[PDB]
Amino acid sequence: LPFTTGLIYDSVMLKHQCSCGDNSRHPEHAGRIQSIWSRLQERGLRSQCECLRGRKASLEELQSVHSERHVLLYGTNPLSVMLPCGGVGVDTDTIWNELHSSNAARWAAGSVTDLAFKVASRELKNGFAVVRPPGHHADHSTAMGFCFFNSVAIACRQLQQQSKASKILIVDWDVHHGNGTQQTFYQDPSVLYISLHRHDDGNFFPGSGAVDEVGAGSGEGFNVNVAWAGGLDPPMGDPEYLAAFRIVVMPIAREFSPDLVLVSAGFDAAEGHPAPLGGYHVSAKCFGYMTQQLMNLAGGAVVLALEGGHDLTAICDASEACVAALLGNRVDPLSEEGWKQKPNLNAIRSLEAVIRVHSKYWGCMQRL
Numbered sequence: 110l111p112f113t114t115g116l117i118y119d120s121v122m123l124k125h126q127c128s129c130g131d132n133s134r135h136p137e138h139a140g141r142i143q144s145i146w147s148r149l150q151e152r153g154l155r156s157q158c159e160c161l162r163g164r165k166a167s168l169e170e171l172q173s174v175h176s177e178r179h180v181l182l183y184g185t186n187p188l189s190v191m192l193p194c195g196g197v198g199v200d201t202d203t204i205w206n207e208l209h210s211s212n213a214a215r216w217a218a219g220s221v222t223d224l225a226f227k228v229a230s231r232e233l234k235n236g237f238a239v240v241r242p243p244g245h246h247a248d249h250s251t252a253m254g255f256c257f258f259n260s261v262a263i264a265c266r267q268l269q270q271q272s273k274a275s276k277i278l279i280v281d282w283d284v285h286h287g288n289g290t291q292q293t294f295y296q297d298p299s300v301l302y303i304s305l306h307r308h309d310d311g312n313f314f315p316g317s318g319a320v321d322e323v324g325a326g327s328g329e330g331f332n333v334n335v336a337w338a339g340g341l342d343p344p345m346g347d348p349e350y351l352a353a354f355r356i357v358v359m360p361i362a363r364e365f366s367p368d369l370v371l372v373s374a375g376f377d378a379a380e381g382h383p384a385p386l387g388g389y390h391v392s393a394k395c396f397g398y399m400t401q402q403l404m405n406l407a408g409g410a411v412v413l414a415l416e417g418g419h420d421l422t423a424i425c426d427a428s429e430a431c432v433a434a435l436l437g438n439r440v441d442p443l444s445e446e447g448w449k450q451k452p453n454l455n456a457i458r459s460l461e462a463v464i465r466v467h468s469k470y471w472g473c474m475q476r477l
């Protein structure tokens with residue numbers, strides 16, 4: 110296998126859809142990964158990468174993060190809740206195809222894991238997983254927010270249990286808080302979880318991920334929530350996220366010094382997502398640049414896994430810029446006006462809260 114960027118995609122994951130067939134009512138649709146996959150070929154990036162199909166996660170791999178009851182319910186064939194539209198699901202948003210959802214969720218978990226091992230073993234330089242359904246909301250014993258199994262958390266656990274990576278950084282720049290990922294690794298100091306999300310004092314899904322939530326026991330200080338407050342006005346975009354990377358994400362990541370970086374790469378903070386889905390204005394160039402910054406860690410061992418993002422144009426633009434970054438294309442910070450603007454007052458106050466809390470744990474957060 111050649112030493113380039115890896116891409117994960119398979120049609121099995123397209124099968125996850127409600128029986129009613131309305132992709133408008135169920136916005137986490139197959140078109141999401143389908144559009145990105147073809148977009149990468151149209152732009153010429155896909156042929157440059159080593160394209161893999163992935164695999165099903167074993168029941169044992171799913172149980173490394175989730176409970177036995179959870180894995181029996183969503184992981185196995187029955188032969189071994191009603192919705193307004195008529196289909197079955199765990200809740201109104203999180204649908205369940207009785208023939209295909211389990212297989213698609215297990216494939217997303219297995220494929221992110223398979224890609225992480227190849228990047229960890231250094232067969233691949235880095236990778237991008239075009240997977241669905243998403244994972245970072247799925248906790249130990251709860252499927253929620255379009256998520257069933259936490260693919261990124263499962264990939265992380267398997268890397269540790271097979272001794273392929275000592276320290277692992279999980280970065281989650283999806284606009285929503287990865288409640289599942291935070292819970293899984295809350296007491297583990299060998300995993301560092303840094304989330305950037307719209308918090309607005311608990312009035313935004315899932316409602317968790319406050320700045321005070323720093324971890325527990327041995328894992329105290331190794332959970333970093335960059336919880337944005339203040340609202341949508343003034344606009345949250347590139348200057349705020351760039352500032353977040355300069356001041357919080359990269360300094361803590363460098364002080365932690367991971368052996369492998371996993372990215373819950375949601376693109377619902379991008380332009381084209383109105384409230385209450387996101388309401389943020391992060392450009393595609395910023396996503397690709399944030400990717401480029403993470404490639405400086407762990408000797409380039411970086412793996413992105415798709416999470417959220419609805420607007421087809423926005424997530425395709427952003428996915429393109431991240432894959433290009435992975436392939437070695439560099440973004441010149443001086444080439445874009447607007448990046449010269451300072452971050453807004455709401456973002457500064459939010460980062461002030463992050464610094465004040467984590468000054469107890471990190472040297473780069475300790476000031477006079």
Ligand SMILES: O=C(NCC1(c2nc(-c3ccccc3)cs2)CCOCC1)c1cccc(-c2noc(C(F)(F)F)n2)c1
Nearest residue numbers: 136137243246254255283285314375385386416417418419
């Ligand atoms: O508030 C939410 N959604 C808003 C609505 C939308 N959800 C999406 C959507 C599209 C693709 C993936 C996930 C959500 C578009 S609109 C829900 C019903 O229709 C009107 C607003 C909501 C609630 C729970 C979870 C999420 C959510 N978004 O991304 C993710 C993911 F897990 F990161 F993928 N989860 C979003």
Ligand SMILES: [K+]
Nearest residue numbers: 281283285305
């Ligand atoms: K997040």
Ligand SMILES: [K+]
Nearest residue numbers: 294300302331
């Ligand atoms: K942690």
Ligand SMILES: [Zn+2]
Nearest residue numbers: 127129194196
């Ligand atoms: Zn339906």
Ligand SMILES: [Zn+2]
Nearest residue numbers: 283285377417
């Ligand atoms: Zn999201």
